[PDB]
Write a protein that binds this DNA or RNA. Structure first.
Ligand SMILES: [Mg+2]
Ligand SMILES: [Mg+2]
Ligand SMILES: [Mg+2]
Ligand SMILES: [Mg+2]
Ligand SMILES: [Mg+2]
Ligand SMILES: [Mg+2]
Ligand SMILES: [Mg+2]
Ligand SMILES: [Mg+2]
Ligand SMILES: [Mg+2]
Ligand SMILES: [Mg+2]
Ligand SMILES: [Mg+2]
Ligand SMILES: [Mg+2]
Ligand SMILES: [Mg+2]
Ligand SMILES: [Mg+2]
Ligand SMILES: [Mg+2]
Ligand SMILES: [Mg+2]
Ligand SMILES: [Mg+2]
Ligand SMILES: [Mg+2]
Ligand SMILES: [Mg+2]
Ligand SMILES: [Mg+2]
Ligand SMILES: [Mg+2]
Ligand SMILES: [Mg+2]
Ligand SMILES: [Mg+2]
Ligand SMILES: [Mg+2]
Ligand SMILES: [Mg+2]
Ligand SMILES: [Mg+2]
Ligand SMILES: [Mg+2]
Ligand SMILES: [Mg+2]
Ligand SMILES: [Mg+2]
Ligand SMILES: [Mg+2]
Ligand SMILES: [Mg+2]
Ligand SMILES: [Mg+2]
Ligand SMILES: [Mg+2]
Ligand SMILES: [Mg+2]
Ligand SMILES: [Mg+2]
Ligand SMILES: [Mg+2]
Ligand SMILES: [Mg+2]
Ligand SMILES: [Mg+2]
Ligand SMILES: [Mg+2]
Ligand SMILES: [Mg+2]
Ligand SMILES: [Mg+2]
Ligand SMILES: [Mg+2]
Ligand SMILES: [Mg+2]
Ligand SMILES: [Mg+2]
Ligand SMILES: [Mg+2]
Ligand SMILES: [Mg+2]
Ligand SMILES: [Mg+2]
Ligand SMILES: [Mg+2]
Ligand SMILES: [Mg+2]
Ligand SMILES: [Mg+2]
Ligand SMILES: [Mg+2]
Ligand SMILES: [Mg+2]
Ligand SMILES: [Mg+2]
Ligand SMILES: [Mg+2]
Ligand SMILES: [Mg+2]
Ligand SMILES: [Mg+2]
Ligand SMILES: [Mg+2]
Ligand SMILES: [Mg+2]
Ligand SMILES: [Mg+2]
Ligand SMILES: [Mg+2]
Ligand SMILES: [Mg+2]
Ligand SMILES: [Mg+2]
Ligand SMILES: [Mg+2]
Ligand SMILES: [Mg+2]
Ligand SMILES: [Mg+2]
Ligand SMILES: [Mg+2]
Ligand SMILES: [Mg+2]
Ligand SMILES: [Mg+2]
Ligand SMILES: [Mg+2]
Ligand SMILES: [Mg+2]
Ligand SMILES: [Mg+2]
Ligand SMILES: [Mg+2]
Ligand SMILES: [Mg+2]
Ligand SMILES: [Mg+2]
Ligand SMILES: [Mg+2]
Ligand SMILES: [Mg+2]
Ligand SMILES: [Mg+2]
Ligand SMILES: [Mg+2]
Ligand SMILES: [Mg+2]
Ligand SMILES: [Mg+2]
Ligand SMILES: [Mg+2]
Ligand SMILES: [Mg+2]
Ligand SMILES: [Mg+2]
Ligand SMILES: [Mg+2]
Ligand SMILES: [Mg+2]
Ligand SMILES: [Mg+2]
Lengths: 205, 127, 260
RNA sequence: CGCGACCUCAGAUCAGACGUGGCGACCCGCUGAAUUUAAGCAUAUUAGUCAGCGGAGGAAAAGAAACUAACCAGGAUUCCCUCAGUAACGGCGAGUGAACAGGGAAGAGCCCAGCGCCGAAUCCCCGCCCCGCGGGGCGCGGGACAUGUGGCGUACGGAAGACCCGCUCCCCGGCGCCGCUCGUGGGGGGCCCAAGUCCUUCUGAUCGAGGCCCAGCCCGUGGACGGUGUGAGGCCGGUAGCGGCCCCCGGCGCGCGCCCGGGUCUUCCCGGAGUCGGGUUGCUUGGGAAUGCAGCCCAAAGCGGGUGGUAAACUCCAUCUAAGGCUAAAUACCGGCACGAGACCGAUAGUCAACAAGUACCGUAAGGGAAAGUUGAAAAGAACUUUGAAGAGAGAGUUCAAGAGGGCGUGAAACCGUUAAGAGGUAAACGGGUGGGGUCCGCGCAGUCCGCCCGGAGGAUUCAACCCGGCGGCGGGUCCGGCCGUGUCGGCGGCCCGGCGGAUCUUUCCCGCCCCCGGGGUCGGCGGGGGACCGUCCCCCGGACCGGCGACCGGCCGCCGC
RNA sequence: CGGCUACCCACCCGACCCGUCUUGAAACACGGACCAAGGAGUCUAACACGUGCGCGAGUCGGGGGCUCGCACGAAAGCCGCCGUGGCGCAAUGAAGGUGAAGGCCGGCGCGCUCGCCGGCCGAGGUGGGAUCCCGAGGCCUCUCCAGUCCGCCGAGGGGCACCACCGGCCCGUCUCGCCCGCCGCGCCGGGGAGGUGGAGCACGAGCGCACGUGUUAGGACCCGAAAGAUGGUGAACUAUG
RNA sequence: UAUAGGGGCGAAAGACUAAUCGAACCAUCUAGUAGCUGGUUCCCUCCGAAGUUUCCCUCAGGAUAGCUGGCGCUCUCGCCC
RNA sequence: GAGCCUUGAAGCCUAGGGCGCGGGCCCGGGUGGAGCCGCCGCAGGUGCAGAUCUUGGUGGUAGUAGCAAAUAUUCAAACGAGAACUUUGAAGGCCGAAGUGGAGAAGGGUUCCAUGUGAACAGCAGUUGAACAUGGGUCAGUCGGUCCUGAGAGAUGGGCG
RNA sequence: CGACUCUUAGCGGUGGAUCACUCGGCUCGUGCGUCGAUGAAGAACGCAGCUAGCUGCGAGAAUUAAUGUGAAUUGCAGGACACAUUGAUCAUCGACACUUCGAACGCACUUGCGGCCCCGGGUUCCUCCCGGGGCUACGCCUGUCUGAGCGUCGCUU
């Protein structure tokens, strides 16, 4: 059965795959369905923007993607309490609320708090009866538009720290050599055994 | 060009609906044009033909100047029969020749209150 | 097929009862009972290679090759010899690619469209399309295609203001947009050089949409014009230039045939 | 002894109401092989599938962590691309085979047992009144359930009780009418543009060139079908934010019923048990010192329990809070009701079935299962005469056609009958070479060649030879009058009355900010805006090159019809 | 009159009935009475090689999104602060991990089988190697003279691709020895000289699409079994109560 | 009327079980697999074998090498050596 | 391709003319009556002499074998175009009461009866029939089922699953 | 000379191949989500003037009523031919009706045998008297009625 110099092949076709063949013949059909679903939502539901609730600045958990940034799920109840609004009142304002998201970083805490301040500044609400809570006159001719597209804030915000102009400096360039990484690696590998030998030296007198 | 996606361009489906259409559809199928003076007088393009309409035939074996009154309308065969149009059999018995009503120019309609309402709707829709 | 002639349960005879080794449907009374079962060589049998639905139908093209083909078709539409060799009647027609005013795109009635084609002499091509609208050759008349309606001029525009209505029922015409350039409409049948009629905004938007060799395309993101292989490509001028004929051996036109 | 109450129960053809069964393409729960591969065959693969059984819905399941991860951490379920044919499993053979990220569609969150507080403030039923249309739902009086625990307040994201603070004044369930709505809300009925004209073929025309210098008419309608053939106009049909009527669904705006949330402090409460887990044994998984499920046994804890992918002990840390429950969206659909399209098939193909097809017929039964389309435009399907008893036939007639005569379009091969030609002891047939005969083809068979030049014979013509008159084309010089192509400077001029991009800048510019002593400190740091500089387009004069497909005028030689 | 020809016949010569298992078929080897229709290397996934095109250290929108509702529109066009992601640009180790630049000149330490400082060049050398460059020389109807003109070459040189060899660098092991630094002076790290194992580096050639061949798994060029499993139907024949 | 398929029943022949019994019939898995028979569809041109080495529970088979075809690339000749 | 045509397309036949080496093709002549082809690209369910090939049709055999298990028919007349066979008269026979007789159960379903036809059926034939077409025919307190249990089959209570 | 046999051609004969056509399949996609105890799917029987099948119906049986359209269905006689009355056919169907078996339901089913309640005639009334109408299956939920205990207890003989 095999042949000349070619790669060893093990295809997973021994199972009766001919019954379960899902071929995307309805891919433009689903595209038209989902276009009509988004358009019918934007017509019938509200003058709320498409992708309605606002998403947080969120760092990805990895040693791979944590340099990048992500639109998360919700605004992490401690952050929402620092912003100072009730939970379901925030949900009806348009704030996405997730009760699971914790806060280890004061930097991300204050970043989401400033994002909430920006969203509260950009918020224009419409109550039913004209008793004017938190509104005024015809603001910006009904705010010049009705429905936004793909997030009100464009929630990526890939921050660009530059640090362009600096002078070459003192003995830090002689001190930050390759040997610091190997010394830190050896210290991390031998952190515990040295403590055990120190305990044994203190014990044996 | 056809733009509404709820109507067929299919030859099999069109022939199926045509040769299996019910009688109230076949009345609309068996419609006949009018003479130029009658369409000038009534402001209408064409009318469905009935039992007591006078007919001048424009095409076929019998052509022109033969204004006669129809007698039968077989909507099963899509054929009207005309009293003037005759053909003898072998045994000397006359029989009416099959004429399709689309090759039929009506010179005199039948006056009825229902046909006046139909003609008024035709004129109002033609505008 | 998807449900073949395997509805018939059948077994083969074997050694005795020596008709064949093909499976045979089993029964009585009915004269089919004993005939050929599923198989390629039998009556009513399963065909060879039942053509399944998961054939590799749709073929992806590189977008650079797509834009390359669009640029090649639009460039070949400018030469008069190519479009006359495709067969459009460009005898009394004025200068190549025709640019009409901005009052054309706001037409409503198609009598103005017919009058415009008669004054721009594309009515000869439209009359050729009228003269050739014959019946389809072959069995393809059954599946709702009974017309050989050959392609004529195509009008390329922007700012649709009723020009699709004015050009909608002209035979052989092609509704085509600047932002959506179709290869299947600009070069039908794999042949280049189709007669096209532009507009002022169209003919000014082409340079914005593709660019020259100096600047990039401003409407597209990362597209440039392709590399031009032979810049001054007049081969007769090159071979009759003095710099080439200075370095030639000699015209050797003797024959030196077979000597008996 | 009898009477009564409660608890366990039985009866009824008690009043009211509910499940059975079918389809089952998609979905859920169980269990469930072997052919095949491994070239042999047991483990393995086939396959946690085929068959079998039980259920419901237009979706089902799942779904708010006893989660992923281990760093600058994320955060319900589902679906797609990647992860990935990878980690891993495997007579480590054949082969099998995930997951976390990450990018997208979708986004909606919640409730209950416990804990206490409310004099059961709660629900089911019966009878009459208040009620409106097409019909059943709130309020009055007594019969039951429930204190072995209804309902409100409560949900692990903390909750509750009492003071202080400035405040908030409210919802969802009806009812007639008025203008709507993105296809101009749902479906159904009925209608709407324009040659049938002159000529000629044809049985018939929808065939054939033309309808005045405005292209004969209509077009938001030239898709398709039927009509005696090949029609945009002859016919319902096709386009149209086209019109007129009826039926239904929705959000505005007069009655009826309910209507204290936020921040600080104090006090109190703070949780699902034969269940997790351990041993052992079967199935399954990629899951290996055992991923999940299940049988038996042992069977808890409260600074507790689970997870942390190598079993175990000690220690530290991260994350979650299981043994209770609901929830639309993205997803699937070969069953069904209508629906539109096709680089598909063409009566031995395509579904078994284009047709009185799951029909005829076969087998006791489970079950098996066909063959079979076409006259013509219209039957106008052959009147009548004649032979035979009729079947059939000869005349006659219809039709363009009986050479279309009731399984009737076209009508080949195998095979048969007749006629014409030829031949026949080595079975017939074949290849090479001729000969004879026959059908047929091209032509006139003692008579068939053309195109040019020149010397001879009559005739009618007008240009050509040279010039005047005329427009159109070729060619090149002054590159003359001026547009433009290639690199170069300049007005930095359109930099504020300009476009593109720069992890190159301007902390003596502005705004929102942090820090130190309402003000001051660039004293240091974050985001956005203004503009300084770098590589290409937009005008100009001054200039080099080709005047190159970039072309007009002025002039010249040499063309050209009239 | 001429005529080859899918017409017929006669004559001379040669000539066993096709297809395939086979070393060997006309075989007393098998299939074939005749004729009409159907009938057998297809499609998907993956790999490898060759070719064609686009871009090119990058490449690719197949996953979604954007356009006004269109018959062809289930097409096509665009995204780019949608490049997440696949392949390639880095390999070697089981792994912890580590990870491809050297050469020349001057001075310094005993130029010491030995390190430092300053400057310069830069992917090394050798033998072949298409091509390309300089050029002695001589050749054009009567003389001194020249420029393009007719017009090649002895010899020399820089050397594409590629081949062969030497040398160098990187990773894991093996042998020998010395030196250097301290966010802490330790069973801490790093460096040198040699011969080995690698699918490496030693100026990269890939990505996407299409076509052709070959292989694999799927019914896999067509037809074929004795057999196995699952679920149902029969004691009207027969066997026994 | 009862016994129904690895079951029934058998004065025992493995006989009978609906013309089939040393394991019935119908349908499905299933187009089960076969190193084994038979077949595999137009023309022209060019090149053109082998029945051998080694290995295999290998001996009617396969792998590898050999024989062969296709696609090219690097060069060399045309002017006493 | 301003392609071909109802003044005749595809298809089929041809002792006709020709081309190409060959796959095949073009023209002429005869039926036919509505669709067809050429070039350039594209995609195939794309070419048959075989496979005890599948379906359908047709020859040699071949007017051949065979219309032979059970003793047997013969004359006249009649309806009828038509008689070895239909009906009647007569004669001779067979079955011979364990029947070739008269009626039943299971099974068949109109086959029972009358009239008319004889292309179709009956292995020749028909004027005949169980063939065909039309019209008729089955009358129950006291015949049987219905009632009863037999071998046995069976649901609830219960158990298993 | 004829008969028989072979090869062509013309014509004729079972044969229906090729060609042409399609009220047919196949594939793909979209829209909606729909059976039954108020009798589902399926089956049996019956129904037309001449009516075997398919199709359509259920003793109101080739359809009834209503709405819309507007002079027919048709092979044949007839029938409504009326429309200054109501109106044939066709489609829609929203109102009535829907034999028997069938989850099938009073029992197993042989269309047999019953048991209650009511109404009409038969001796004007039950007493196993004819016809018609309603009910009479299993399990289970909530509530009502009845009673079983040496299950527990109160009061009394
Ligand atoms: Mg091979
Ligand atoms: Mg399989
Ligand atoms: Mg169709
Ligand atoms: Mg099968
Ligand atoms: Mg199958
Ligand atoms: Mg088939
Ligand atoms: Mg054809
Ligand atoms: Mg094998
Ligand atoms: Mg085996
Ligand atoms: Mg398994
Ligand atoms: Mg199953
Ligand atoms: Mg059910
Ligand atoms: Mg349902
Ligand atoms: Mg759930
Ligand atoms: Mg493997
Ligand atoms: Mg598995
Ligand atoms: Mg929770
Ligand atoms: Mg037509
Ligand atoms: Mg038309
Ligand atoms: Mg019209
Ligand atoms: Mg804890
Ligand atoms: Mg613990
Ligand atoms: Mg713990
Ligand atoms: Mg641990
Ligand atoms: Mg561990
Ligand atoms: Mg829970
Ligand atoms: Mg749950
Ligand atoms: Mg859902
Ligand atoms: Mg046919
Ligand atoms: Mg058939
Ligand atoms: Mg007809
Ligand atoms: Mg004719
Ligand atoms: Mg015929
Ligand atoms: Mg004919
Ligand atoms: Mg025809
Ligand atoms: Mg013939
Ligand atoms: Mg003869
Ligand atoms: Mg062999
Ligand atoms: Mg041999
Ligand atoms: Mg042979
Ligand atoms: Mg033999
Ligand atoms: Mg033989
Ligand atoms: Mg034979
Ligand atoms: Mg064939
Ligand atoms: Mg390649
Ligand atoms: Mg990336
Ligand atoms: Mg990969
Ligand atoms: Mg088989
Ligand atoms: Mg076995
Ligand atoms: Mg018996
Ligand atoms: Mg016995
Ligand atoms: Mg069994
Ligand atoms: Mg078994
Ligand atoms: Mg037997
Ligand atoms: Mg056996
Ligand atoms: Mg068995
Ligand atoms: Mg096979
Ligand atoms: Mg061997
Ligand atoms: Mg080999
Ligand atoms: Mg070779
Ligand atoms: Mg070679
Ligand atoms: Mg051809
Ligand atoms: Mg084939
Ligand atoms: Mg095809
Ligand atoms: Mg054949
Ligand atoms: Mg062959
Ligand atoms: Mg055979
Ligand atoms: Mg025969
Ligand atoms: Mg004989
Ligand atoms: Mg004999
Ligand atoms: Mg006999
Ligand atoms: Mg007589
Ligand atoms: Mg007589
Ligand atoms: Mg006697
Ligand atoms: Mg006796
Ligand atoms: Mg007897
Ligand atoms: Mg009888
Ligand atoms: Mg008689
Ligand atoms: Mg007979
Ligand atoms: Mg009969
Ligand atoms: Mg009596
Ligand atoms: Mg039982
Ligand atoms: Mg029970
Ligand atoms: Mg046939
Ligand atoms: Mg009525
Ligand atoms: Mg009753």
């Amino acid at each position: 059965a095999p042949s000349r110099n070619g790669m060893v092949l093990k295809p997973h076709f021994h199972k009766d795959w001919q019954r379960r063949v899902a071929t995307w013949f309805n891919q433009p059909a689903r595209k038209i369905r989902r276009r009509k679903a988004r358009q019918a939502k934007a017509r019938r539901i509200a003058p709320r923007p498409a992708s309605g609730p606002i998403r947080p600045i969120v760092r990805c958990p990895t040693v791979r993607y944590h340099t990048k940034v992500r639109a998360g799920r919700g605004f992490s109840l401690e952050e929402l309490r620092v912003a100072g609004i009730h939970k379901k009142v925030a949900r009806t304002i348009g704030i996405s609320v997730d009760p699971r998201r914790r806060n280890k970083s004061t930097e991300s805490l204050q970043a989401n708090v400033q994002r909430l301040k920006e969203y509260r500044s950009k918020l224009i609400l419409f109550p039913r009866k004209p008793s004017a809570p938190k509104k005024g006159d015809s603001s910006a001719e009904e705010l010049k538009l009705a429905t936004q597209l793909t997030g009100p804030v464009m929630p990526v915000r890939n921050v660009y720290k530059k640090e362009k102009a600096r002078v070459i400096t003192e003995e830090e360039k002689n001190f930050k050599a390759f040997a610091s990484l190997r010394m830190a690696r050896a210290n991390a590998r031998l952190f515990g055994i040295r403590a055990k030998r120190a305990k044994e030296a203190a014990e044996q007198d | 060009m056809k733009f509404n996606p709820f109507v067929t361009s299919d030859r099999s489906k069109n022939r199926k609906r045509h040769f299996n259409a019910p009688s109230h559809i076949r009345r609309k199928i068996m419609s006949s044009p009018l003479s130029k003076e009658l369409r000038q007088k009534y402001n209408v393009r064409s009318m469905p033909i009935r039992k007591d309409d006078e007919v001048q035939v424009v095409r076929g074996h019998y052509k022109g100047q033969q204004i006669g009154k129809v007698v039968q309308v077989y909507r099963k065969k899509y054929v009207i029969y005309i009293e003037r149009v005759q053909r003898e059999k072998a045994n000397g018995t006359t029989v009416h020749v099959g004429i399709h009503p689309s090759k039929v120019v009506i010179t005199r309609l039948k006056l009825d209150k229902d046909r006046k309402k139909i003609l008024e709707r035709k004129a109002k829709s033609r505008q | 097929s998807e449900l073949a002639g395997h509805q018939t349960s059948a077994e083969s005879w074997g050694t005795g009862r020596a008709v064949a080794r093909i499976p045979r449907v089993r029964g009585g009374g009915t004269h089919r009972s004993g005939q050929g079962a599923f198989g390629n060589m039998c009556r009513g049998g399963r065909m060879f290679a039942p053509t399944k639905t998961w054939r590799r139908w749709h073929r992806r093209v590189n977008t650079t090759q797509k834009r390359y083909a669009i640029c090649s078709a639009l460039a070949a539409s400018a030469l008069p010899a190519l479009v006359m060799s495709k067969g459009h009647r460009i005898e009394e027609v004025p200068e190549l690619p025709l640019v009409v005013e901005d009052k054309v795109e706001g037409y409503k009635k198609t009598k103005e469209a017919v009058l415009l084609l008669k004054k721009l002499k594309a009515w000869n091509d439209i009359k050729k399309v009228y003269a050739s609208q014959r019946m389809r050759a072959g069995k393809g008349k059954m599946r709702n295609r009974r017309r050989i309606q050959r392609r004529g001029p195509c009008i390329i525009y922007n700012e649709d203001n009723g020009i699709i209505k004015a050009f909608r029922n002209i035979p052989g015409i092609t509704l085509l947009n600047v932002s959506k350039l179709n290869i299947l409409k600009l070069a039908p049948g794999g042949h280049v050089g189709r007669f096209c009629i532009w507009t002022e905004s169209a003919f000014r938007k082409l340079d914005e949409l593709y660019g020259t060799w100096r600047k990039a395309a401003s409407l597209k993101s990362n597209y440039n014009l392709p590399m031009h292989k032979m810049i001054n490509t007049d081969l007769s001028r090159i071979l009759k230039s003095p710099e080439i004929q200075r370095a030639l051996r000699a015209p050797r036109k003797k024959i030196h045939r077979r000597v008996l």
